[PDB]
């Protein structure tokens with residue numbers, strides 16, 4: 001997260017860290033056994049880490065659970081990143097409490113101007129790598145579709161939305177992928193891509209979760 005602030009331990013209880021011997025992507029807990037992240041974060045050997053704040057120290061509240069299966073959207077295209085969503089089923093359910101909690105899926109899409117909270121342990125520099133030990137937060141608005149398409153002409157599909165600041169300085173970055181964009185208490189976006197980090201006129205692009213709620217429900221129901 002570039003231009004963000006320290007969230008505070010366990011203030012974002014649905015945030016998860018996907019670990020394969022090191023933190024590689026973020027994710028969101030939507031029920032005690034399922035997590036939603038990005039299809040480009042897929043790999044085998046994933047351990048889901050819940051209740052985390054400092055990813056390099058065990059401080060208490062952490063629950064490490066292995067993934068039983070990862071379901072990448074069948075129409076995910078790795079070249080355009082269209083349908084960049086993946087569901088991970090956990091080997092055992094998580095114990096939910098005030099530090100580990102699920103986030104609700106939306107009933108409607110959000111409109112431009114809506115302010116959202118993006119969080120993650122991704123890079124905090126737009127030029128160079130500085131990865132933090134604790135969770136960072138950033139409040140960003142969803143942008144209008146014209147500003148998004150004017151920023152990435154021909155690269156935005158209807159399953160993507162831009163959120164961020166065109167003046168630059170604040171944005172999500174590498175390491176944040178798969179993580180949550182929460183607006184009014186609902187999961188509305190998944191950190192997907194962007195051109196560099198916090199660059200002027202290059203806002204972050206996110207998976208538009210409201211278009212996948214029926215798919216998420218049907219898939220969890222049959223797995």
Ligand SMILES: NC(=[NH2+])c1ccc2[nH]c(-c3ncccc3[O-])nc2c1
Pocket residue numbers: 171172173174175176177191192193194195196197198203204205
């Ligand atoms: N500007 C953004 N909102 C953004 C978000 C996620 C990213 N992930 C990456 C990224 N991921 C994997 C390898 C290289 C990258 O620059 N860049 C990213 C940029």
Ligand SMILES: [Ca+2]
Pocket residue numbers: 052053054055056057058059060062
């Ligand atoms: Ca820790």
